[PDB]
Amino acid sequence: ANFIAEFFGHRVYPEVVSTEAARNDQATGTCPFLTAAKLVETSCVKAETSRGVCVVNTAVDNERYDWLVCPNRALDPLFMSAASRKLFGYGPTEPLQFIAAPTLADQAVRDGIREWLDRGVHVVAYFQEKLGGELSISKTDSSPEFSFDWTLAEVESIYPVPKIKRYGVLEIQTMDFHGSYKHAVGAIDIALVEGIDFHGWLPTPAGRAALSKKMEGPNLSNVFKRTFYQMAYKFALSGHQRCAGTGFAIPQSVWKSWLRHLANPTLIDNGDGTFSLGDTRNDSENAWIFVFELDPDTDASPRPLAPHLEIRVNVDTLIDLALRESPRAALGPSGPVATFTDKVEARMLRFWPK
Amino acid sequence: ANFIAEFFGHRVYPEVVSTEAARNDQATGTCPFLTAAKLVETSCVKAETSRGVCVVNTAVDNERYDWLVCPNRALDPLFMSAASRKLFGYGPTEPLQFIAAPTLADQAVRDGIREWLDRGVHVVAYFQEKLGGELSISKTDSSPEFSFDWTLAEVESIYPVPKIKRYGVLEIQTMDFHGSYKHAVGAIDIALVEGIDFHGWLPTPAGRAALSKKMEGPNLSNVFKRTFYQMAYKFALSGHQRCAGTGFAIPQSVWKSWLRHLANPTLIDNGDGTFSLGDTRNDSENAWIFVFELDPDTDASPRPLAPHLEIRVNVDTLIDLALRESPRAALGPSGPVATFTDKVEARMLRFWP
C-alpha cells in the first residue's frame, strides 16, 4: 500500500519515469537537486537505511499522496525565487536575480552584482544548510534559539562591504515516517547492482512488492506539532521592520493533513491568484504558506516544484484555529469527546469474564 | 560531559547505588517500575542500543540536571494517585483506592470495589499503555486523533455493568536526546558480564569515561514543540463537563528548559502548596502541570517521584506566553533579532578574500 515514489530524484512507483540520466543518478547515488544547485556532483546525504528515498507515496482517507521525505528534495531555487517575490513585494514580471551565498566568493559574480544594483535589478542571496549554511538567532532567558532554513538577503550595496536593505525567511517542511525503509531499500538495491534491467523490473509485481516491502505511513501529527510552533513564533518575528516576510513551503499532501488540525478552514479568495487564512486586510506581518506540488505536467527527469496554493496567513487566526476552534469542534454535539465516557466504560467492561 | 545517570532504575553517575537488588535488576535487565506495577517480572522495553538507559545526566547553563529518558521511569502509581486527588478534587487526607484497570479481571478485587463504593471511599481505575492500554479520541474533519497516557476512571457503579462519575487525564513527558547511547551502553555491557565487581568499576576514571562515551545532550526544543501543542489542545478538552481535569507530569529539568519558551514566567504563589501560571480565579478548566523530582532524600534502590512544583495553568496565558510574549522579548532591545541584520552582513562578508 505504501511505496517509495522517487529513487534519487526520479519517479519509480506511479510511473517508472526513467531517462538515461535517471539510470545514472540511481547507479552513482546522486541527489540531482544538490548537484544542480552546487554545480558539483553530490550523493544523497542519507544513511544507508534510507539512501535515495526522496519521496514516499501513501493513501490517506482513500486518496493517493506523494510525501516529500528529504528537505533537499524541496531544494528548488527557481521555485524559491518566485516565492521570494511574494515576500519582498515584487511584481510577477520584475527583473530578479536569485543566487546562492557561496557564489559571493567569486569575483565574476561580485562584479555582476554591482552592475545589477546600478540598473535597479533586485539582487537576493540565499543562505541554506548546504549552500552557505543556515543562520540562527541565539537564545535568551525569555526566548529560545531558532534556525532558519532559507535566509534571503536583499542586497543594497557591496562596494566596500556587503550591506543589505531587507532580509527574508523561507521555512521548508516535508514529512517523516513510521518504521523503516531499510527493507524496501535493501530489496531494490540488489536489483540495481546485481540486476540486468532495473527500470524494466520496477513496474512488475515483484518490483512493486519490493518498493512497498514493510513501508509504513506518515508521521502526520508529529510534523504539525513541530511546524505549528515554528509558524506561530517565526511569523511573529516577521513583524520586525527589517524582515520583509516569512513563508513556509510545504507539499500539498502535508497541507491537506493539516486541515483537521486547523478545524477545516475555509480559505478566502482574494481574486489575485492568492488565498487568505483569516483577515489579513490590516496590520500585516507578511506571513505566507506556499503549498507546492511535484509538477505533474513537465515530463522533465526530476519533477520540479510547482505552486499549488499561495496563502497569506493571519497569525492570531492560525493560533485560534488550531488551539481553540479545533478543540471546540472535538467538544461538539456529535464529536469524539461526547461519546468518550461510554468508551471508558466499554474498555472497563472488556476485563469482565465470559 | 554527559553521563548515563541510571542503569535499569539504579543510579550510576553521580553516586553508584550498590545494593543486591540494584545488582540483580541490572544483570537480569528488568525495568523495576513495570515489574512493580503489574507484579510480574518485565524487562526494559528498549532496543539493544539504549537498553537499560532509564535516565541521563547533563549540564545546561553550567548546572547539573537529571533527564528522564523513558516514560516507564515515570511509571509511579503512588505519585499519580496524589496527582489525581488534585484532578478530581480530593483533600490531602481522605480515603482513595488507585488501581490498574487489568485488575478488574479479578473477582476478588471486583467485590472489593463494591465494598469501597458503598462506604463512600473513592475508587479510580487507570488505563496506561502497559497497564490496560491507552484510550484515544478519533479524528474528524475539524479535529485530529489524540491518545491519553493515563486515563483515570472515577468509578460509581460495578454491580450490573461498570459505570463512572467522571474521567481524568494524566499526560507524561520525559526527554529525548541527540546522537546515540550505543557506545556508552556497549562499553558498560562488557563490564557487566565479562568482568567482575561491576559497581566497583563504575566510579573509576575509566568507568566514568565509559558512561560518557559519545553521550550527547537533551533534545530540549523538540520536547517543548510536541508537548506544548498537547497541553493547549488537551487542556481545552478538559473543559468537558464529564472531565474532572487534565494534568501534565514533567521532571524539574524539562520545566527549567521550558522557562525560556514561556517568556521567563513568574509563578503566583497561592499559599496552599500550589502555584499558578496566569489568572485561575474564574472559569476552571482544572488544568495542571505537575513538576516532579527524582527523590534525593530516600536512598531506596530506584528513587521514586517526589512533588517539586504543583502548578495550575490558565490555558489562554500559556498560549500567550509561548506564542506572543516570548517572540516580543526576542524583538526587544538587545534582543537577537535587533542584531540579526549585522549577522547576515557578517556571514556575507566571510566569502570575501
Add this chain to the structure above:
DNA sequence: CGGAGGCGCGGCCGCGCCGCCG
C-alpha cells in the same frame, strides 16, 4: 468478527552553526 494496516506518541539518529573555554 479477526488479521492487517494507520497513526498518535515519543524516544533514537546525525548535520552544521555558534557559543564557550583556553
Add this chain to the structure above:
DNA sequence: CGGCGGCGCGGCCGCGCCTCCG
C-alpha cells in the same frame, strides 16, 4: 583568535491502540 561541544532541526524507529476490509 581554533576545536570541542550544545542544540535546533527534522528525519528514522517500533508499541499498541483502533478502524477497515474480507
